[PDB]
Design a protein around this ligand. Structure first.
Ligand SMILES: O=C(O)[C@H]1NCCc2c(O)noc21
Ligand SMILES: O=C(O)[C@H]1NCCc2c(O)noc21
Ligand SMILES: [Zn+2]
Ligand SMILES: [Zn+2]
Ligand SMILES: [Zn+2]
Lengths: 259, 261
């Protein structure tokens, strides 16, 4: 049986190729997670189909219906066999799905438009002229909803009440908002994507400050699925052989246009 | 069914250390450190009584190539002497094949410790020369990293290290540090960034971590394969990390206690 692999369009993990229109199936896509899947699949010995998660989300639970969306939902409700994406290992998710050991480390970070007088979360939290938000339906937004350390609680309180909404549907949307808001909008997102964007034309954004936390991405499977075991072992072997570090260099820095 | 959980661990600063007055204290109270703090938390959130015990042979764990027997903290779990290990125990493939690991509670990488002023900036630097000697911990993941590496700079360093005389390998982290301090810059030490960074904050303040990490990995809390504890422990680590506890603990034992301004 072919493995249904759910993933999301997010750079530089999974992207459509320049010439995608003439390509078919898995060949249409390229990127870090695209290579990883091939590798995972090779060492685990399976054929698989890359499909793009329908609602374009990572996954969260509707507090009312208790229904999961995003890639989490596709796994939980049986639509997909495995998620290969920049999906953050968290407690509420681990309660309903399986994660492999982290294939990549990262932290919540701040993106600014160059020249923006912000150096920290502290800075953001003690001012009002510059708006800031996060990705909706992701681990980052949950972070602030659950974090009552002084600075963060203050920020969440501002964000959860802010108007018009500081929250965004995708990273691209968040990133475009920073770029067009003449420095009046900052964007909270994971260091991996932040660092990546900093190295792309128009080269007008930067990561300022350090990460707010430490965590990781895991390959996810439905609870107690037969693939979880081998997948997990594969990730370890891949990390140990330098392949992961190799892919990260290939997709981040070898592919960087801000010299 | 009320069983005190036997916790195997290792004496490694600042993870687990003897209290100055341990001679007058009993049980768990004899000890202090990051992993001592962690152990108390994990047991509280998993609802169990536990006894801290120092690993008998003082090692992390490797499989003897001849006898095929596992030593160190890993062996303790494999052969049933202990119920759980809570230490700076690196998650690796060969270990994961024989025991269970939680999701990582701390991140790290192989790094270079030098005596200050030692003309070394990188691994490539070590490999390109011979005046300065360098070694790793025995029976650890770092050594195995090099013995297995297929990348040029690392195979070079390995083939040098494995044949070098006298041996550039040490029995304990402390032995490696002292050797750096006493070797006038003629010896450099390969170890994980977490320990490197700790030691750089201690008197006499004569060492430093140079370069970037060679790799990226994690410490995990280990249980015997199939043990019932694994699930809760794993869930506990994820919550403690999200509630910020792990971040606090690293502050407490590394930086709030720095002797080097
Ligand atoms: O939800 C997730 O899996 C996280 N990884 C993707 C990027 C992200 C984000 O912007 N907020 O939370 C996350
Ligand atoms: O083996 C291990 O679990 C690693 N963590 C402890 C310190 C260490 C070391 O010096 N080499 O490898 C390791
Ligand atoms: Zn391969
Ligand atoms: Zn003593
Ligand atoms: Zn607690």
């Amino acid at each position: 049986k072919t493995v249904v692999v759910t993933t999301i369009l997010e750079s530089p993990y999974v992207m459509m190729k320049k010439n995608h229109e003439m390509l078919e199936g898995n060949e249409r896509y390229e990127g870090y997670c695209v290579d990883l899947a091939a590798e995972i699949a090779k060492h685990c010995g399976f054929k698989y189909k890359l499909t793009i998660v329908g609602d374009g989300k990572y996954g969260a639970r509707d507090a009312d219906t208790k229904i999961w969306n995003g890639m989490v939902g596709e796994l939980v409700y049986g639509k997909a066999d495995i998620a290969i994406a920049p999906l953050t290992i968290t407690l509420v998710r681990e309660e309903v799905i399986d994660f492999s050991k982290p294939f990549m480390s990262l932290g919540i970070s701040i993106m600014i438009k160059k020249g923006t007088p912000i150096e920290s979360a502290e800075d953001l939290s003690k001012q009002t002229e510059i708006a800031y938000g996060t990705l909706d339906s992701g681990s980052t937004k949950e972070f602030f909803r659950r974090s009552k350390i002084a600075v963060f609680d203050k920020m969440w309180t501002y964000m959860r009440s802010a108007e018009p909404s500081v929250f965004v549907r995708t990273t691209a949307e968040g990133v475009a908002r920073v770029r067009k808001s003449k420095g009046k909008y900052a964007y909270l997102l994971e260091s991996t994507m932040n660092e990546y964007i900093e190295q792309r034309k128009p080269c007008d954004t930067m990561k300022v400050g350090g990460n707010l936390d430490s965590k990781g991405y895991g390959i996810a499977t439905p609870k107690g699925s037969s693939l979880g075991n081998a997948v997990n072992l594969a990730v370890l072997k891949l990390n140990e052989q330098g392949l992961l570090d190799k892919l990260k260099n290939k997709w981040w820095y070898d592919k960087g246009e801000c010299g």
